[PDB]
Short mmCIF file of C-alpha atoms (C1' of nucleotides) and ligand atoms in Angstrom, two decimals:
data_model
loop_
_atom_site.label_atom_id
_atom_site.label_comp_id
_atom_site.label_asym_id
_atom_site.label_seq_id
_atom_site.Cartn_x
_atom_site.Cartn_y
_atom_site.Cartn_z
CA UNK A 2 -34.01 19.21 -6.93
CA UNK A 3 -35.10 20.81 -10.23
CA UNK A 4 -37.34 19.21 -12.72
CA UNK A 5 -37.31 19.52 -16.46
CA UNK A 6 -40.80 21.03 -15.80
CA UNK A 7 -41.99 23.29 -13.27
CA UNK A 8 -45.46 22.58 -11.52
CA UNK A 9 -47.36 25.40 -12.71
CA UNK A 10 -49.60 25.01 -9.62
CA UNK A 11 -46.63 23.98 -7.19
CA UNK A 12 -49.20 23.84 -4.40
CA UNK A 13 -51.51 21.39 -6.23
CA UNK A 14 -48.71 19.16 -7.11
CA UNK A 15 -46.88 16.63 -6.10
CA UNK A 16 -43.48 14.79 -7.25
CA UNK A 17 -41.23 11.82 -7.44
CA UNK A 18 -37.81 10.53 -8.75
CA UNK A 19 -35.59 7.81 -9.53
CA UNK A 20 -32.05 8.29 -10.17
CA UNK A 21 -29.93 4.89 -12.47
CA UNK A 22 -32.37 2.56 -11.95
CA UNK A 23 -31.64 -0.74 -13.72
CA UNK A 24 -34.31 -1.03 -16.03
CA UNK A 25 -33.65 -0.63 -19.79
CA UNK A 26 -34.04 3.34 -21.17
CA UNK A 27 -35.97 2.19 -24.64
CA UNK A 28 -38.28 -0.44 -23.08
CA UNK A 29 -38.92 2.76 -20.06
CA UNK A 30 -39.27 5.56 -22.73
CA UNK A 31 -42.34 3.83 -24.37
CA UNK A 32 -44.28 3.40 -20.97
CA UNK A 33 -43.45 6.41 -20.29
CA UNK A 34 -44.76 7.58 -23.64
CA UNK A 35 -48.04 6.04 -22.79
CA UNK A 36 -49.20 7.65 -20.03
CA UNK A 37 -48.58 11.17 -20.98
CA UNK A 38 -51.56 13.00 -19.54
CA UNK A 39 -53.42 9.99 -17.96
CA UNK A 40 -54.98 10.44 -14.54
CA UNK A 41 -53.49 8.24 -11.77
CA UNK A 42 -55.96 5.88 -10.94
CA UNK A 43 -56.26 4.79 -14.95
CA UNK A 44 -52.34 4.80 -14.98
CA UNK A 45 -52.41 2.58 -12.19
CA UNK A 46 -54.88 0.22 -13.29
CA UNK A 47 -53.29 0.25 -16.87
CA UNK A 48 -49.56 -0.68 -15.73
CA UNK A 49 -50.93 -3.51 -13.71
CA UNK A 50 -53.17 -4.67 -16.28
CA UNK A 51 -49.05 -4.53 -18.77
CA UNK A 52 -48.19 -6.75 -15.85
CA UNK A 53 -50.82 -8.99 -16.22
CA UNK A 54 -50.38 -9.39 -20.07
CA UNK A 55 -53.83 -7.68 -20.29
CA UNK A 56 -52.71 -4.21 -21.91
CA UNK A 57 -49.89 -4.07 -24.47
CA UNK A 58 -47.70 -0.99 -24.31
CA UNK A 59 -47.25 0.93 -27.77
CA UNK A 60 -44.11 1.17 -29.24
CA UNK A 61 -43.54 3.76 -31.59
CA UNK A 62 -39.44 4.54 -31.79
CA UNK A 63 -37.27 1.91 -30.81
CA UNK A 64 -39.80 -0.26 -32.25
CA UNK A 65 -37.17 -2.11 -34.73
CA UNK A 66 -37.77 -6.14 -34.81
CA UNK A 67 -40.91 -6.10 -32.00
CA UNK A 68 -43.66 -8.24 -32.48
CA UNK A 69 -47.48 -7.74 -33.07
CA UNK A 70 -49.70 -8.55 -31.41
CA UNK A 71 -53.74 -6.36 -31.68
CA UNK A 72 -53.86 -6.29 -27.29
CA UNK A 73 -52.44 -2.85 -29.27
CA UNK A 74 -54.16 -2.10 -32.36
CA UNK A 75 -56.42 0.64 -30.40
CA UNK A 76 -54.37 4.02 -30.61
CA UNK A 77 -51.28 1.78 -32.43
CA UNK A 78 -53.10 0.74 -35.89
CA UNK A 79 -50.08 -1.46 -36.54
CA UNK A 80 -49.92 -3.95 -33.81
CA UNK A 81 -46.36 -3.19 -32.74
CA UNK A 82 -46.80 -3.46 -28.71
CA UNK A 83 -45.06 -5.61 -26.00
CA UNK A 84 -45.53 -6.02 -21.90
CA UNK A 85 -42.45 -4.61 -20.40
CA UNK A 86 -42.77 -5.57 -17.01
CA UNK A 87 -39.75 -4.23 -15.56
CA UNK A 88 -40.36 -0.77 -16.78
CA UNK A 89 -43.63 -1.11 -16.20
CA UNK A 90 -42.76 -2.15 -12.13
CA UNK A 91 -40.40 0.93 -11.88
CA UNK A 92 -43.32 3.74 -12.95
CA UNK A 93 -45.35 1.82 -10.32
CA UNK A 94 -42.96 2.03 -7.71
CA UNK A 95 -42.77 5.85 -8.76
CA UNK A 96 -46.20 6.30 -9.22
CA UNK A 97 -46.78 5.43 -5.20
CA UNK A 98 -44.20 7.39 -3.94
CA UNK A 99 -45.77 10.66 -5.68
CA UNK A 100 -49.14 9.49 -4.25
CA UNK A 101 -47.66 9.45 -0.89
CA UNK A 102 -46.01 12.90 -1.46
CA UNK A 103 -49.73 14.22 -2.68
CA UNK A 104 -51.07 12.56 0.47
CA UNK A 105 -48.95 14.69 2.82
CA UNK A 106 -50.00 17.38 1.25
CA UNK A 107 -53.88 16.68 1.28
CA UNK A 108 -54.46 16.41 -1.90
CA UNK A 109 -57.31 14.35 -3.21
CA UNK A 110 -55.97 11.04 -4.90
CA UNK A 111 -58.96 11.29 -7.44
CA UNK A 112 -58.75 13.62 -9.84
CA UNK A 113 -54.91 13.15 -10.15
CA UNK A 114 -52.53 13.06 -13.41
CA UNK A 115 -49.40 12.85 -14.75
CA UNK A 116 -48.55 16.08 -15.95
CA UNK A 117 -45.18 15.12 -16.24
CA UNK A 118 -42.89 12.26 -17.15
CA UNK A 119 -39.73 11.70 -18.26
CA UNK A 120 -37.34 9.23 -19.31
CA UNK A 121 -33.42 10.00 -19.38
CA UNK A 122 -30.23 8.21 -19.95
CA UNK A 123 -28.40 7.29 -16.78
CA UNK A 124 -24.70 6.27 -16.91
CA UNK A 125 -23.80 3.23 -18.55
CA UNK A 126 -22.96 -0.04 -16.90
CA UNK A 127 -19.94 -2.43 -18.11
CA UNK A 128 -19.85 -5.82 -17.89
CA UNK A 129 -18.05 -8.36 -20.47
CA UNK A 130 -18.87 -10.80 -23.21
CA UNK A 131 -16.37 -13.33 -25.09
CA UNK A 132 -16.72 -13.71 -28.94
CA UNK A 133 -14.81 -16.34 -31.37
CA UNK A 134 -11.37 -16.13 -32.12
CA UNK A 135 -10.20 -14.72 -28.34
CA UNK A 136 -12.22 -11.47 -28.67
CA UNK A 137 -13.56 -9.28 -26.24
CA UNK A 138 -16.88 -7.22 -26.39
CA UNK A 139 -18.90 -4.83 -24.32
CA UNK A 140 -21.97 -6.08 -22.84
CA UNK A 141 -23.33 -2.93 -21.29
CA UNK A 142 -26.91 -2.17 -19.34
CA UNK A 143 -28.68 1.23 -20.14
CA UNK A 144 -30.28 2.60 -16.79
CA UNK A 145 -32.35 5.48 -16.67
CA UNK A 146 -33.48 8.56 -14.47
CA UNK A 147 -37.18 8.96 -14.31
CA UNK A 148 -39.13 12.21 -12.95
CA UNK A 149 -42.70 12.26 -12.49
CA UNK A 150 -45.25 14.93 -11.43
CA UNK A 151 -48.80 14.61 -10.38
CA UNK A 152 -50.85 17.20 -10.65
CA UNK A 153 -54.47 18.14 -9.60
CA UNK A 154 -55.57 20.67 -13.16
"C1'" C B 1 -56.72 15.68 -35.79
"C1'" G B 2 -52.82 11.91 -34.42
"C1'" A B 3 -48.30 8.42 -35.10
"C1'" C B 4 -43.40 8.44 -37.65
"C1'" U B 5 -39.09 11.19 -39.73
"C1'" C B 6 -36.59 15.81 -40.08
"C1'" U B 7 -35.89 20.55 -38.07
"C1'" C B 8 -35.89 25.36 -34.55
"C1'" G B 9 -36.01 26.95 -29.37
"C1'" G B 10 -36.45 26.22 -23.72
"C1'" C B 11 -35.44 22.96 -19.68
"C1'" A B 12 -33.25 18.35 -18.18
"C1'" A B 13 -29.42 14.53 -19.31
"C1'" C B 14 -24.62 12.41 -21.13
"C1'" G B 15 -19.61 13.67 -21.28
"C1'" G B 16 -15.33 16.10 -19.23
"C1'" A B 17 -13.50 20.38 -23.06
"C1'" U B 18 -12.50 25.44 -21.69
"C1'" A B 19 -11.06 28.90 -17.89
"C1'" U B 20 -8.47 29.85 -13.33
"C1'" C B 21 -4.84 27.00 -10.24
"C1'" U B 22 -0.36 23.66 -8.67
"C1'" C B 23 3.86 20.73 -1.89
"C1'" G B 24 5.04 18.13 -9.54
"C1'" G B 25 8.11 18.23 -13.90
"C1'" C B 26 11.99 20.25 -17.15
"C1'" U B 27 16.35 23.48 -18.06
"C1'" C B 28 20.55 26.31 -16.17
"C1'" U B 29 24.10 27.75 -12.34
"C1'" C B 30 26.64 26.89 -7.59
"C1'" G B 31 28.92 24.12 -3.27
"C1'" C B 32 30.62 19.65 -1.21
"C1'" A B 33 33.28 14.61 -1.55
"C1'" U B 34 31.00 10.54 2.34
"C1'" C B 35 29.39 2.82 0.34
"C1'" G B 36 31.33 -2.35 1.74
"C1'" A B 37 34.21 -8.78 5.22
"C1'" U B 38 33.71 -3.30 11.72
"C1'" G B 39 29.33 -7.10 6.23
"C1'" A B 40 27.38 -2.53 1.57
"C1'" A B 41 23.71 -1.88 -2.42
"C1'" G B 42 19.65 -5.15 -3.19
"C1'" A B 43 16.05 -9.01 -1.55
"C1'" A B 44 12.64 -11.31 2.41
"C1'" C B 45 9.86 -11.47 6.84
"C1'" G B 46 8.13 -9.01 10.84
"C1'" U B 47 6.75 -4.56 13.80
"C1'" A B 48 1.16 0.09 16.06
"C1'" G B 49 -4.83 -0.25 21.09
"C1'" C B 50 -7.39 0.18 16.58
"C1'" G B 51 -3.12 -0.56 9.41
"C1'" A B 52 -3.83 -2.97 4.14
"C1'" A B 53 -0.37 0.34 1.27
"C1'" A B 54 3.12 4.32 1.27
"C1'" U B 55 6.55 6.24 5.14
"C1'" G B 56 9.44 4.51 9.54
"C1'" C B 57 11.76 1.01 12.33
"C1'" G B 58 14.20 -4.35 13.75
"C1'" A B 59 12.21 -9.17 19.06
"C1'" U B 60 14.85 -2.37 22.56
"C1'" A B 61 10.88 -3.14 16.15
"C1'" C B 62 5.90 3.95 13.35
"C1'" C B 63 10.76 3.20 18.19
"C1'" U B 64 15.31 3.29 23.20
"C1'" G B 65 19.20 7.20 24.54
"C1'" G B 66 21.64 12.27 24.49
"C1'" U B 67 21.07 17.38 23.40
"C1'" G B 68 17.72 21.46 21.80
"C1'" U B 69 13.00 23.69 22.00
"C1'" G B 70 9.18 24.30 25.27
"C1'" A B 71 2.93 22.26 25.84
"C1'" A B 72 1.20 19.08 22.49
"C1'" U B 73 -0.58 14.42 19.37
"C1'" U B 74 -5.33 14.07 17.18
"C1'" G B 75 -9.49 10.10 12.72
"C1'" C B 76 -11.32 7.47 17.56
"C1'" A B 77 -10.16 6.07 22.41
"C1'" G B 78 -7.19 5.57 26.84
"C1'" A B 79 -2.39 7.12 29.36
"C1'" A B 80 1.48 10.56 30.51
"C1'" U B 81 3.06 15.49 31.30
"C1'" C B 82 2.79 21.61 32.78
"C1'" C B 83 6.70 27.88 37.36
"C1'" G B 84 8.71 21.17 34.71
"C1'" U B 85 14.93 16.49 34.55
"C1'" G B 86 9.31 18.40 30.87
"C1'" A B 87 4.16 17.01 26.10
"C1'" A B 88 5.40 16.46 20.94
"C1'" C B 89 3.14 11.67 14.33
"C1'" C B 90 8.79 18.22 17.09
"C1'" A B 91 14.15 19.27 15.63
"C1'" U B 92 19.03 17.39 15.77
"C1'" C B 93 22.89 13.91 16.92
"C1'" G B 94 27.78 12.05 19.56
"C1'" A B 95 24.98 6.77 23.18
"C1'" G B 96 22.51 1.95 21.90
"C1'" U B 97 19.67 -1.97 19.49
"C1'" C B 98 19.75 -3.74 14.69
"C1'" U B 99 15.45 -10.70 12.60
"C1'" U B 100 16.42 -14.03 7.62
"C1'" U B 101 19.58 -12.98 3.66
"C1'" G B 102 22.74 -10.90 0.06
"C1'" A B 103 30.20 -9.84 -2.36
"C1'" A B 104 28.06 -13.75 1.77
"C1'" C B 105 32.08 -16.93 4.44
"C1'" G B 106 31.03 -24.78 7.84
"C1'" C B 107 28.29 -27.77 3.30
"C1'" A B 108 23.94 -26.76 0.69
"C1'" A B 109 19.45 -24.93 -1.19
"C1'" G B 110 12.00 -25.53 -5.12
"C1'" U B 111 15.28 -28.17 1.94
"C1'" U B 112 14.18 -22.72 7.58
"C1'" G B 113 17.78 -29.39 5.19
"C1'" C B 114 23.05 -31.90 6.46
"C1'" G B 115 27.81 -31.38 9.74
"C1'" C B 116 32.07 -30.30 13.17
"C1'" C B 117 34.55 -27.33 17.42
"C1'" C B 118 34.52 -24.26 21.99
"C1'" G B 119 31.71 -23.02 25.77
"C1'" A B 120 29.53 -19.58 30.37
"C1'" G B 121 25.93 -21.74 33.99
"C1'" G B 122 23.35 -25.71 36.23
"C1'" G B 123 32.44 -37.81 35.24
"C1'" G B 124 28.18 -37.51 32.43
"C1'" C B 125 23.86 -34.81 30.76
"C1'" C B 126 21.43 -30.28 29.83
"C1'" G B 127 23.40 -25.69 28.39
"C1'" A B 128 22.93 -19.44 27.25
"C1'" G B 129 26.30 -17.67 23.81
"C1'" G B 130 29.83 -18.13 19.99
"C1'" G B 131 33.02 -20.15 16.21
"C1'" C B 132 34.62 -23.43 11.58
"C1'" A B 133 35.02 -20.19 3.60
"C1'" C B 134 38.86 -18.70 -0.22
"C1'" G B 135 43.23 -15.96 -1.84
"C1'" C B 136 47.24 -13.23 0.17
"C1'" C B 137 51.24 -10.55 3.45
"C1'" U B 138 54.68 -10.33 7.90
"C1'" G B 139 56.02 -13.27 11.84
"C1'" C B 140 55.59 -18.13 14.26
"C1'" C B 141 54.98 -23.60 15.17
"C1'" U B 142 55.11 -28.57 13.30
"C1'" G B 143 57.28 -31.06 9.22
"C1'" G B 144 59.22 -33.32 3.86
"C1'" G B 145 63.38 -34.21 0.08
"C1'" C B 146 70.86 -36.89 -0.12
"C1'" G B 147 68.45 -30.38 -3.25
"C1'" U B 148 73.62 -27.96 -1.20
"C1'" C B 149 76.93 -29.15 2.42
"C1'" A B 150 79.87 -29.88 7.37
"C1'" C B 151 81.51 -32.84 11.28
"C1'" G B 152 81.01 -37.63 13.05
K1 K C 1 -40.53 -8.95 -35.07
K1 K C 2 -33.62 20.20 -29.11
K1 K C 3 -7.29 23.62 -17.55
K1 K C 4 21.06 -32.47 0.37
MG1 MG C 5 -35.54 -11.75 -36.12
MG1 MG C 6 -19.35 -16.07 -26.85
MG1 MG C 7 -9.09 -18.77 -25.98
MG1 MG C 8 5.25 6.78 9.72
MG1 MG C 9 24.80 -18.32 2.23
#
RNA sequence: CGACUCUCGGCAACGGAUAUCUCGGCUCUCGCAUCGAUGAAGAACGUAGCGAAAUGCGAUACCUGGUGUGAAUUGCAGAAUCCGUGAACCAUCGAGUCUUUGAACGCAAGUUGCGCCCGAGGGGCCGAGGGCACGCCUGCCUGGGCGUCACG
């Protein structure tokens, strides 16, 4: 399979992926967004602390109508932030499969990082909703794919 | 320096256009003349070692028989067959079978409902199997009426 980025040190590095996983693209995009160059054992430790309602996650687009909250108002002066735990449980998941893949390989879990992520938009589901008046609407899910590489520098 | 918005490029997505096809369609021309009370067209229900549909068939039920060809069928498995009266999800057709219906015909019908007759075969009982609609034609049998007569 082919990334949207190569390694750069394909020997140092290790990957993972997750093809339509049900887990809303815009709440997945932001966690995403916040661990951009993180190592793994703060990524970790930060997506359990989301979990635990202990660390907000910052949203920046698709931040229309979302709360406040200052668990944020580090690196988001505005305290737009929220705890999405399902996207937050999928980059786990993700997260220990790559640290498996590194494993295999031998290299060190410390001084690990994301130097990639990505969030894309997976086919849409349909389901159904009924409205007033005998009307019919689309009540649709937004899955994603997610790609991840760990790399050592 | 960063976030946001906009924009340019690279890669990845989303979507199914374009291109090349095609056991289909459309148009034209030709030949032939063959449905049914000997039960048609249509409808239902069944039928395979594993099948729901489509296709096929009818309790002989993806087939029996004859002829032809001549070694397969296959998704899986088991059987049969090979210098042979002999394989085939083969071709073809003269021999057969052909459930419930339907013009549908004992009477009905949102009913597998309600009758009558004959009868192999084992007085009576049990029978397998089969009959019993309407209109009409030719002939036939049994009849009706002083309608027209004849003789008693
Ligand atoms: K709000
Ligand atoms: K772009
Ligand atoms: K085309
Ligand atoms: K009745
Ligand atoms: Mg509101
Ligand atoms: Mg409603
Ligand atoms: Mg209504
Ligand atoms: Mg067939
Ligand atoms: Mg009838």
């Amino acid at each position: 399979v082919k990334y949207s980025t190569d390694p750069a040190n394909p020997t140092k590095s290790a990957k993972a992926m997750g093809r339509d996983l049900r887990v809303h693209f815009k709440n997945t995009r932001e966690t995403a967004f916040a661990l951009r160059k993180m190592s793994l054992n703060k990524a970790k430790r930060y997506l359990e602390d989301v979990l635990a309602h202990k660390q907000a996650i910052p949203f920046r687009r698709y931040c229309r109508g979302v709360g406040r909250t200052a668990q944020v108002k580090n690196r988001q002066p505005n305290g737009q932030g929220r705890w999405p735990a399902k996207s937050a449980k999928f980059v786990l998941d993700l997260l220990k499969n790559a640290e498996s893949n590194a494993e295999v390989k031998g290299l060190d879990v410390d001084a690990l990082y994301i130097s990639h992520i990505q969030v894309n938009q997976a086919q849409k589901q349909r389901r159904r909703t009924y409205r007033a008046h005998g009307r019919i609407n689309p009540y649709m899910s937004n899955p994603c794919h997610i790609e991840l590489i760990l790399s050592e520098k």
